[PDB]
Design a protein around this motif. Sequence first.
Motif, mmCIF file in Angstrom:
data_model
loop_
_atom_site.group_PDB
_atom_site.id
_atom_site.type_symbol
_atom_site.label_atom_id
_atom_site.label_comp_id
_atom_site.label_asym_id
_atom_site.label_seq_id
_atom_site.Cartn_x
_atom_site.Cartn_y
_atom_site.Cartn_z
ATOM 1 N N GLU C 234 0.809 -1.209 0.000
ATOM 2 C CA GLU C 234 0.000 0.000 0.000
ATOM 3 C C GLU C 234 0.842 1.259 0.000
ATOM 4 O O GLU C 234 0.790 2.112 0.887
ATOM 5 N N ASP C 236 0.515 3.081 -2.889
ATOM 6 C CA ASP C 236 -0.174 3.988 -3.792
ATOM 7 C C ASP C 236 -0.297 5.342 -3.129
ATOM 8 O O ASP C 236 -0.221 6.385 -3.788
ATOM 9 N N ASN C 280 -1.764 -1.943 -6.364
ATOM 10 C CA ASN C 280 -3.069 -2.483 -6.706
ATOM 11 C C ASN C 280 -3.695 -1.727 -7.859
ATOM 12 O O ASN C 280 -4.757 -2.119 -8.350
HETATM 13 MG MG LIG Z 1 -3.211 -1.613 -2.759
#
Ligand SMILES: [Mg+2]
Lengths: 152, 906, 391, 101, 384
Positions: C234, C236, C280
């Motif tokens: 994570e 992003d 993601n």
């Molecule tokens: Mg993600």
Amino acid sequence: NVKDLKASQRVCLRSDSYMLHKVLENKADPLVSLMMVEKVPDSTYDMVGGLTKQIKEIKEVIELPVKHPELFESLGIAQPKGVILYGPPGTGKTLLARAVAHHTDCKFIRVSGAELVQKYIGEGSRMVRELFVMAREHAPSIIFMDEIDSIG
Amino acid sequence: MVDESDKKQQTIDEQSQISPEKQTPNKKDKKKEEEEQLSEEDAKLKTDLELLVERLKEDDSSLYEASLNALKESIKNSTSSMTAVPKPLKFLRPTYPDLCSIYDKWTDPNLKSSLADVLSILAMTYSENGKHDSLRYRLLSDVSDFEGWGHEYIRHLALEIGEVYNDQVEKDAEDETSSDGSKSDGSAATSGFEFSKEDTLRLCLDIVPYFLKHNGEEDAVDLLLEIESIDKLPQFVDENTFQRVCQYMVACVPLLPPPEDVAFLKTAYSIYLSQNELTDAIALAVRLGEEDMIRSVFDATSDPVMHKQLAYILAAQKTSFEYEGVQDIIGNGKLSEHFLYLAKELNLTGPKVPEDIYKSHLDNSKSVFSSAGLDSAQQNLASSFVNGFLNLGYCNDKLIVDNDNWVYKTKGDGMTSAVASIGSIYQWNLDGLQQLDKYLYVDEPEVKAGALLGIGISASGVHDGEVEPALLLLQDYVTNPDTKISSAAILGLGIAFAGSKNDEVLGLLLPIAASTDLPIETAAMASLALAHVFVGTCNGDITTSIMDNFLERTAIELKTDWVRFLALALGILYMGQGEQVDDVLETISAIEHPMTSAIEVLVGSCAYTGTGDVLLIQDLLHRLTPKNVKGEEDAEIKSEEKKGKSSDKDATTDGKNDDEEEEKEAGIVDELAYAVLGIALIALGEDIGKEMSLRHFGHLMHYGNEHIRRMVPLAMGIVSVSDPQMKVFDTLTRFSHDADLEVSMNSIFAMGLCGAGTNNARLAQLLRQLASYYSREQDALFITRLAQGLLHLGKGTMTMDVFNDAHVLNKVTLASILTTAVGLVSPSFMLKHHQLFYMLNAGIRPKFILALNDEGEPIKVNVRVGQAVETVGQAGRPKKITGWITQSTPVLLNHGERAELETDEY
Amino acid sequence: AAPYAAKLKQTENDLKDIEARIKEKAGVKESDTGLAPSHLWDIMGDRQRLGEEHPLQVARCTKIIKGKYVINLKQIAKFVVGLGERVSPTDIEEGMRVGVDRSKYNIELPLPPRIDPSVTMMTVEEKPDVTYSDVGGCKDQIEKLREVVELPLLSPERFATLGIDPPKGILLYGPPGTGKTLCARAVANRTDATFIRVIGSELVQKYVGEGARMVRELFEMARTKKACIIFFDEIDAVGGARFDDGAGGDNEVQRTMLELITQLDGFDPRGNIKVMFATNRPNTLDPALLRPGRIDRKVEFSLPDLEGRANIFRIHSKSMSVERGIRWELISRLCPNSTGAELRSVCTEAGMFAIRARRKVATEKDFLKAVDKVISGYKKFSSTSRYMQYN
Amino acid sequence: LRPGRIDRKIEFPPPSVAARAEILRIHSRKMNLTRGINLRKVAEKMNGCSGADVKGVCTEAGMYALRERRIHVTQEDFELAVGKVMNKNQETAISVAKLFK
Amino acid sequence: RCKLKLLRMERIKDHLLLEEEFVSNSEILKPFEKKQEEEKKQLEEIRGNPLSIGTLEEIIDDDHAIVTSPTMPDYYVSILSFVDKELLEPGCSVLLHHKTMSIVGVLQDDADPMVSVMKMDKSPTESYSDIGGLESQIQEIKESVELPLTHPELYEEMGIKPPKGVILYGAPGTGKTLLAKAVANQTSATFLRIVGSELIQKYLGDGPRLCRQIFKVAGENAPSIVFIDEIDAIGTKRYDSNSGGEREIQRTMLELLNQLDGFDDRGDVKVIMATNKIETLDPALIRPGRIDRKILFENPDLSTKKKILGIHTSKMNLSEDVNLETLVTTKDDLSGADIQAMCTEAGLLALRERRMQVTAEDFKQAKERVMKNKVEENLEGLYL
Ligand SMILES: [Mg+2]
Ligand SMILES: Nc1ncnc2c1ncn2[C@@H]1O[C@H](COP(=O)(O)OP(=O)(O)OP(=O)(O)O)[C@@H](O)[C@H]1O
Ligand SMILES: Nc1ncnc2c1ncn2[C@@H]1O[C@H](COP(=O)(O)OP(=O)(O)OP(=O)(O)O)[C@@H](O)[C@H]1O
Ligand SMILES: Nc1ncnc2c1ncn2[C@@H]1O[C@H](COP(=O)(O)OP(=O)(O)O)[C@@H](O)[C@H]1O
Ligand SMILES: [Mg+2]
Ligand SMILES: [Mg+2]
């Protein structure tokens, strides 16, 4: 001893190696911090009077279920929740909530949408549970969360 | 409000809100002139009533109180109550709310005291007329609700409650009580109770029991019968009327100690017999313990019918529920007498049909094998018994058993108990006989003995009807002189018949348990068997068993262990009643030595059963005496001391368990906390006392049928590894077993760690292994409940062999007892007219809500599950029949009961 | 009201009063740990007690003076200290902690560097032991991981024979629900290499400059460790886009973005740190980790194929109790192209239909119902062929 | 505003003229008045829509009386205060127009 | 009524329990046993008088640690090590000895002003089926939330992963918020409840830090249920735009993905989410395969409101003038919070007359006031 001692009680020490001596005869409540820095004295219905109707309206749902919750059990009513006071500013909207509270013996907790009333948690989000828990310690209570919505 | 003057109907009510001008001035002046104005006063009575009726709406006391305050005066000042004595008497109707309005709606010491007495005398005398009855009634169903009457109507009825209660406490009764004046019975207050009862049955269920309990007579209850029997269906439904009847009896279990309680339960039976469900009649008939009522119900179904119909199948199913089999004996013999259909009915009553339905349940469930074969030393004995504990009930694991390698490497007492574990694999099943035959005809006298133990266990699912009972095989083996042979025979005999009685069984268990002259430590099993035979019915309290207990104690203490078993056997025997256990407590206590005090403390637990709260303080008072004696000094014996201490620990717990089922069932949860604290007290109080109390805790839970089976065994288990006596884990797992592989997963996981992790004796290791394997079966094949099932407030008989084993330190000798675990519970299944081995639907719900029953009823909401499921224990007990949508009618009600379903379809 | 009703209120209030009483008399206490294999602890407790041998005011070297050192105590106060008799000429390094004596300041015991680590230790945990025999995605995509991440940890011998600088970095990017975290857990059992897992959104602090410290500390500490994988999850958030504002408040967050560029590239390359980055969205990445020189071959984890879904559902149904004779190919057909996680919830809903049906197995029929449930779910939502826009 | 959490709504309207006269009286109970002042007469001069306006008329009357340095608040100070506070209504934000579409 | 029997039996066993405990403690909690007397002699030999509090930064694997005290000075402490060296870890509060600072022991169990917010300050007093009606899809919340805790048995027969998570959605007035608190009653698992407007803060970066905490607490209880009330309040709410904005919202969604599952592999947390805006969320949480069954609730229809209204009027004193079925009849597919509001306003009209009996008039007049809130919350009145 340990059964005369409970949490949030101020004590006096004689430092023989921090030997607990007596309870202290003073405490400053953490709910009273908010109320202090706000600073409110008591009011009654001569600070509202001349609109005699208002006192009746709020008496039914605010005052009585503090005084006797047996009425509302017999009735079967599910007990009151939020109550909106609105009107021109200068009609003593705050003064009515003060007026109920001295008679009912509630802690008149005027919140104002401030970060200045606190100095011990310091944000309003985390002081929603806790404000309730203090108002339960010192119950009965009136949480006068005055929203303003001037903020930002 | 304000007085303004009368010119319409609204403003008359306003006038009299401040000051009546019609009830106060007018009536008063009139009464003190002439006794010809008594004719007018009767006409004005109706007028006075109507103004009261209108004004029962004013919330605060002041302007109803004060307004009627001089009317309260008029009673004694002008009416007098003696100017003719019909006329003032009939004018008391308006003045009676007025009296209550100063009495109760104003609490003031001078007038509240005085006016309690006034309300009693005038109420009783004016209910002779019957207008005092009607006067309450217009206020009972009132006009409007406000503060005032919420107190007022309780005052009217409190006069009645007051007098009947006081007549029992006081040795004076009648009108000599000074806070009343109402006579104790008579006929002037008798009519007040009759009218008051009709209305309060219709709308409430509140004062209805209160009054009966105060009468203390089944007469009072029989008057209730008349009103209710009309009301059974149309006014309120059969099911509702049933809930009322069981609420009274459940509620008045502490309030009617045993001699009083049974007198009331006789009448509850009668109500049930008159209405539709004879199924609830049987349940209450077992509860009394009365043989006679059972027979009446059997005749009621059987005699009017000569056709197979649901009816014959129904009597046989109802008597089947008691897995004590007190009912099973009664029902076998009327069926032979009637001689319409022998074949289907005799087996069905007996536990023989329950063997067949087990084969169908077993198909879905499968069979779990994980049994240990790892032998070599003591680990041989451990592994061979563990083979049986994982396959309890009816299962099949034939190939492992016929491998006689591990069987024969056991030794001593281990050989006997190894063959016993093999028989409990084929428990509750007639087939499997072939394995026992092998051992019976091979090596040392010991394995022959263990083959017999298997017969007893296997016979628990087939005996009644006297087709291959345990008595038939095992009578021979008692006759045989060898000791091991006799002990194994009579232990198994006791198991098979459980609560059933028969002369051959009883009379066999009679010469022995009377001869204590011979020194046998394995003749405990002789009394143990005798004790079960009596449980489930009104006690014989056999004088033989008390006799031999006394003679053994006199004779020897050289084996304290034998006599210690014997003390318990009496306490298990004395169950089946609580009225009769009073007398034998007195007989044993006549003899007074410190050894006899040991026997007494166990029998005190049983004696006070079902109302005890005196038993509990007493069973703490015993504990203090050791320390008291030490204080005094500050200012052969070995055996005697040991027995004293061990009996006390078992008794304290045994009192708690016994009490908590019988009184209600919501108190069951509270009694669990005492035991936790009891363990902490017992560890600093006595080192020896600790050894016993660990084991008693696990069986505290199983007997009482706690509702929390997840938390407490696992929490106990970690701590109890340090403490001595690993026989504790075995006794925790008898509770934990609940539905298998629900609870039992955590036990296996936790107990395998502590067992593998710690070895500190191979003796200690053996107990720890045995316990895990007990808990599991195979996707909840069977359940264990100490309770009967029919009543979960009731106590069974098969699980009292489980309860036995915690009073004496662990042994290979004890392992033989422990292999048997009968107390199996049937998978509730629908029956029809051909005999069905499965269900259709059930509703399941975690808990009841109802206040009405403490046994509960499932709500009609449930979560739906399919056919073919075993009834599920506590932590999910409520089971509903779902067949209403399939247009079916249960015949045998189930609410979480053990009772198996039968259904009626048109 | 009614005569017995009047008493119910009293008995209810007696219950309320007695619960508080039981609680008060039991008392409140503070649990304290123990140890049963210690029944004697004042065989070595007495040595630690009562004289000075010493518990040390912790300090840290700020500058080596060659022949003494200048330390900053943590009471902040600075002192020149020497060398005692447990310490040599070569044991003390820059920014290293040392313990010194409180009556006279002198290096008593050298100590591991830096007391700031405590939230770089809440991103370190020990490895999840999930197998490599049940994984997410049954494609060739995990063997590409096995050449970049896994094999040079197992065997640097093959990459000395090639003569190439061993391969380190890889991006895991593409559609949601494709089991990117399932394969780094699967690899955590197999390689026996320490795993350090990162949330990129725990790297942001109200007081900007705090997360800059944070990143540097983790990454240099990891070069000291050997044979580890850092899973940048994570990121992003920090690791996203970069842009400039005129009165914004995004810029404080970008500080940690910049620190991610400069620790990875270093002033030397990574000292045996294999890096996996799980994005993601393949649409939020700094354009200086987009360049492939530090992120070597980068393997898109995409949604299952029509043959890949059949495989995935067969792992789930060999693990499930079923009746065999159920087609797992058919089930892939009914589905559109969609996440690997849908097939992971077909079984558990087929398991809830087991209980209503009163089964021990799931059979052919009720998988059809479960398949329909999830499909209508994706109809109700989106990201059924979305990439968060733009492969 | 979710339906069922609001079972009482207390609207305070703009004052009536019986109410607006009494607000003037409330403040004057600490003050000295020259006898004969009717704060109902002043209330008919007011039209108002908040009781804040009348609190400023009393504050002004005692500060005019402070300027004079008389113990009593005189009756012309309550005449001057209404016109001074109305000028103040046109300087905090305009609100009385009658000039509408 | 006649719930007396319960109150007596429970109360009586509590009376005895209070008795037994008091007497057990005093003089028969023997401080005269040698296992208590000899144990404290050599325990206090190293255990204080004042026991200076530390906070544990890190341990070293030689039976040592480096503490930083809250008072100030760090210390290089040893460990008396009868508290089991491998039983403590960073973040713990430690007992140090006042002669030379050695770890005598370790305190366990803490509280923070950040778990004060989470923890319950009440225990629900309305239990299940006070949400009664709309009970035809309560079967996918009593067979994935309650049941695997109640029976792990049925999920052993199928084996694989149990159900985790539900999301409730529909129009408001389908009882979601209390449903969450009512399935918690049954299971007896630690029920945390956190509002979603407290997962929005007016400071930046410390939001994810608050949300990361919430599930670590929950897995520590082996069973918990976490209710997030209004998880559509982290995707519509913001404070200022320089410490809130899109970014603050964005980060917290991403955080909650790792918490719901990610790498952590924590204990059993059942999750309950109530939402009605299910398009302000990441498409990485509203996929099936995390939150297994998604439940739709529709406005209660004519027959369902018959179920709902018998719930609320059992607390009322009904007159024989009262007709419940005509109160149901008029409304057409409307909320069940409305029914709750009309019964409250019926007792308010009954109080206005002053009478604690509730009459038919009070329900039938309160109905129209409730309907005036639908027909003038849109000032269009009859559709134009
Ligand atoms: Mg993600
Ligand atoms: N390919 C797969 N095979 C089996 N299960 C899967 C697969 N993909 C996802 N799942 C299931 O979904 C759960 C959560 O997925 P995960 O946390 O790995 O998200 P992700 O694929 O990294 O996506 P995102 O970055 O969008 O959150 C896993 O624990 C797993 O049970
Ligand atoms: N369908 C219903 N049946 C019975 N009671 C309901 C229903 N819907 C709401 N209520 C009642 O309304 C009150 C509050 O409802 P709750 O907060 O639980 O619901 P919600 O669906 O989350 O949304 P909202 O509060 O906006 O109605 C409670 O008294 C609850 O019992
Ligand atoms: N109803 C009233 N009766 C008497 N004085 C009032 C009244 N309303 C307002 N005041 C006066 O006006 C001042 C300002 O009112 P304020 O408290 O701001 O009103 P609100 O609470 O309606 O915003 C008060 O401090 C008080 O002096
Ligand atoms: Mg204002
Ligand atoms: Mg809502």
